[PDB]
Design an enzyme around this catalytic site. Structure first.
Site, PDB file in Angstrom:
ATOM      1  N   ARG A   1       0.856  -1.186   0.000  1.00 51.45           N
ATOM      2  CA  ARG A   1       0.000   0.000   0.000  1.00 51.45           C
ATOM      3  C   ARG A   1       0.893   1.236   0.000  1.00 51.45           C
ATOM      4  O   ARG A   1       1.013   1.937   1.009  1.00 51.45           O
ATOM      5  CB  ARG A   1      -0.947  -0.019   1.199  1.00 51.45           C
ATOM      6  CG  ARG A   1      -1.846  -1.254   1.266  1.00 51.45           C
ATOM      7  CD  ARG A   1      -2.618  -1.291   2.567  1.00 51.45           C
ATOM      8  NE  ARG A   1      -1.725  -1.247   3.730  1.00 51.45           N
ATOM      9  CZ  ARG A   1      -1.090  -2.299   4.247  1.00 51.45           C
ATOM     10  NH1 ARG A   1      -1.247  -3.507   3.716  1.00 51.45           N
ATOM     11  NH2 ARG A   1      -0.292  -2.140   5.300  1.00 51.45           N
TER      12      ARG A   1
ATOM     13  N   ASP B   1       3.219  -8.283   6.771  1.00 57.02           N
ATOM     14  CA  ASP B   1       2.114  -7.511   6.210  1.00 57.02           C
ATOM     15  C   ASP B   1       1.018  -8.397   5.646  1.00 57.02           C
ATOM     16  O   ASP B   1       0.427  -8.087   4.607  1.00 57.02           O
ATOM     17  CB  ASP B   1       2.612  -6.563   5.123  1.00 57.02           C
ATOM     18  CG  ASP B   1       1.610  -5.452   4.824  1.00 57.02           C
ATOM     19  OD1 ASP B   1       0.971  -4.943   5.776  1.00 57.02           O
ATOM     20  OD2 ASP B   1       1.449  -5.111   3.628  1.00 57.02           O
ATOM     21  N   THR B   2       0.708  -9.508   6.298  1.00 53.20           N
ATOM     22  CA  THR B   2      -0.455 -10.250   5.827  1.00 53.20           C
ATOM     23  C   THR B   2      -1.346 -10.614   6.998  1.00 53.20           C
ATOM     24  O   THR B   2      -2.481 -10.135   7.104  1.00 53.20           O
ATOM     25  CB  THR B   2      -0.046 -11.522   5.082  1.00 53.20           C
ATOM     26  OG1 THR B   2       0.770 -12.330   5.944  1.00 53.20           O
ATOM     27  CG2 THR B   2       0.713 -11.189   3.807  1.00 53.20           C
TER      28      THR B   2
ATOM     29  N   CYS C   1      -0.126 -20.298  -1.249  1.00 52.85           N
ATOM     30  CA  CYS C   1       0.701 -19.721  -0.182  1.00 52.85           C
ATOM     31  C   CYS C   1       1.386 -20.786   0.659  1.00 52.85           C
ATOM     32  O   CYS C   1       0.746 -21.723   1.142  1.00 52.85           O
ATOM     33  CB  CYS C   1      -0.158 -18.845   0.729  1.00 52.85           C
ATOM     34  SG  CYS C   1       0.675 -18.263   2.247  1.00 52.85           S
ATOM     35  N   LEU C   2       2.686 -20.610   0.860  1.00 50.46           N
ATOM     36  CA  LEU C   2       3.472 -21.509   1.691  1.00 50.46           C
ATOM     37  C   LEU C   2       3.365 -21.213   3.182  1.00 50.46           C
ATOM     38  O   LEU C   2       3.678 -22.094   3.986  1.00 50.46           O
ATOM     39  CB  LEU C   2       4.951 -21.446   1.281  1.00 50.46           C
ATOM     40  CG  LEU C   2       5.241 -22.092  -0.067  1.00 50.46           C
ATOM     41  CD1 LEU C   2       6.707 -21.910  -0.444  1.00 50.46           C
ATOM     42  CD2 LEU C   2       4.849 -23.558  -0.011  1.00 50.46           C
ATOM     43  N   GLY C   3       2.989 -19.997   3.568  1.00 55.22           N
ATOM     44  CA  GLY C   3       2.957 -19.654   4.973  1.00 55.22           C
ATOM     45  C   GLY C   3       1.602 -19.839   5.603  1.00 55.22           C
ATOM     46  O   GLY C   3       1.383 -19.419   6.750  1.00 55.22           O
TER      47      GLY C   3
END
Ligand code: HEM
Ligand SMILES: CC1(C)[C@H]2CC(=O)[C@]1(C)C[C@H]2O
Ligand SMILES: [K+]
Length: 406
Positions: free
Chosen positions: A178, A243-244, A349-351
């Site tokens: 952002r 940031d997720t 997504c891996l995380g």
């Protein structure tokens, strides 16, 4: 919002000037502002003239179709606007298969389920510590007092970074999702790299068991990972770690602060938390990126030309009424929770195991101690859109006498 001149191969009736960094009625919530793309008037593929001009798939079916078609929809330039997608060089996200396959395996090593299970005790304890400490105050700024410190501190521990570097790292990661305009994507990328390159170098000389050591000392195709690849991989982990989940947690807690029936369900039926986690991830999905066309392609009657960019918002599939009836309604008993919140295709997504464990822990531990809470009276919770959408501030209030020592 500046409009780029309409390319000649794009027809007028498909134009819909949606700004992914400023979607229309954001005061209704950022996910509902993105859903204006699924309003009645809106074609299933549209061209927007903002952010240099690009296509947008607005339905879950087309989003999934494109994500499973890397031969046409390439990851080499995955961010809007083009300038950012051009400077994006993180690994494995900017590689198509088969090249990304072995890097994905290295990345998966440091954040995968074996590592989450190893960290579970750290995760539980930090969340309990944060929520104690504030439990008796009767109020908090949730973004600042929990949503940021809890996932970032866990990520810093997993990566072996002092944390102290958090303000600088958090500001750089925000710049790439952002942006505020004071730096290009490449400028934020190059600052992230100057931070990371000496740590990588330091950690080939003295390996610890942290994530950055394991990457820098890793192997692809039986040979050593280079310094160049290691920093592009470590950089990716740093932007997702910072940031997720941070942003996602604020969305959930804002929902739960207005929804007592939903709170009671998770207190009375704790085995329902994992399923509620899935339904909050559908409703408060927050990622949106894109792909670039490797060739002209007639896509469901629309001619996309080589080099066109197309936004394939991962958040839109589960808000699609064709995938989930009554899609703005949170129903923990939803028989089929359809979404692409963690992506689709070879880049899924891996995380996500870390994210789910952090979300489940937040839900269980917050509600074990602060079962009754509300948004502060007359507070305005303001949302923000981008590659990762977020919440500005979330002031909560509650009666300390109705909280619980656990
Ligand atoms: C609510 C939390 C999260 C969401 C919604 C999310 C979402 C996504 C999405 C949609 C993608 C696919 C992007 C694309 O196709 O270009 C992705 C990829 C990825 N994410 Fe996550 N993410 C979250 C948390 C995390 C965390 C904490 C990490 C930790 C490092 C992480 C690491 C990664 C990696 C390494 C990839 C790349 C996989 C690949 O390209 O093969 N994510 N994520
Ligand atoms: C799209 C992502 C969520 C994904 C790849 C990115 O650049 C992210 C913004 C962080 C990472 O997890
Ligand atoms: K590139």
């Amino acid at each position: 919002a500046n409009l780029a001149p309409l390319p000649p191969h794009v027809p007028e009736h498909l134009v819909f000037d949606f700004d992914m960094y400023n979607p229309p009625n954001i005061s209704e919530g950022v996910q509902k502002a993105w859903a204006t793309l699924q309003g009645p008037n809106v074609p299933n593929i549209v061209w927007t003239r903002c952010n240099g001009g690009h296509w947008i798939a607005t339905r879950g079916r087309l989003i999934r179709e494109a994500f499973e078609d890397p031969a046409h929809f390439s990851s080499e330039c995955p961010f809007i606007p083009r300038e950012a997608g051009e400077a994006y060089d993180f690994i494995p996200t900017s590689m198509d298969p088969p090249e990304q396959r072995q890097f994905r395996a290295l990345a998966s090593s440091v954040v995968g389920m074996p590592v989450v299970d190893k960290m579970e005790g750290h995760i539980r304890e930090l969340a309990c510590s944060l929520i104690d400490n504030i439990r008796l105050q009767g109020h908090c700024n949730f973004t600042e007092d929990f949503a940021e410190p809890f996932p970032i501190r866990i990520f810093m521990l997993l990566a072996g970074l002092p944390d102290k570097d958090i303000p600088h790292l958090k500001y750089l990661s925000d710049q790439m999702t952002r942006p505020d305009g004071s730096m290009t994507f490449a400028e934020a990328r190059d600052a992230l790299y100057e931070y990371l390159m000496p740590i990588i170098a330091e950690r080939k000389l003295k390996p610890c068991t942290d994530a950055i050591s394991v990457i820098a000392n890793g192997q692809v195709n039986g040979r050593p990972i280079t310094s160049d690849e290691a920093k592009k991989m470590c950089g990716l982990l740093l932007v997702g770690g910072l940031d997720t989940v941070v942003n996602f947690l604020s969305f959930c807690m804002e929902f739960l602060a207005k929804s007592p029936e939903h709170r009671k369900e998770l207190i009375e039926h704790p085995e329902r938390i994992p399923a509620a986690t899935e339904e909050l991830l559908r409703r408060f999905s927050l990622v949106a990126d894109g792909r670039i066309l490797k060739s002209d392609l007639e896509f469901h009657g629309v001619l996309l030309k080589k080099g066109d960019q197309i936004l394939l918002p991962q958040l839109l599939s589960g808000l699609d009424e064709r995938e989930n009836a009554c899609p703005m309604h949170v129903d923990f008993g939803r028989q089929k929770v359809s979404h692409t919140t963690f992506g689709h295709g070879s880049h899924l997504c891996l995380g996500q195991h870390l994210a789910r464990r952090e979300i489940v822990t937040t839900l269980r531990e917050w509600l074990a101690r602060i079962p009754d809470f509300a948004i502060a009276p007359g507070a305005q919770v303001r949302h923000q859109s981008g590659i990762v959408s977020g919440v500005h501030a979330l002031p909560l209030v509650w009666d300390p006498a109705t909280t619980k020592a656990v």
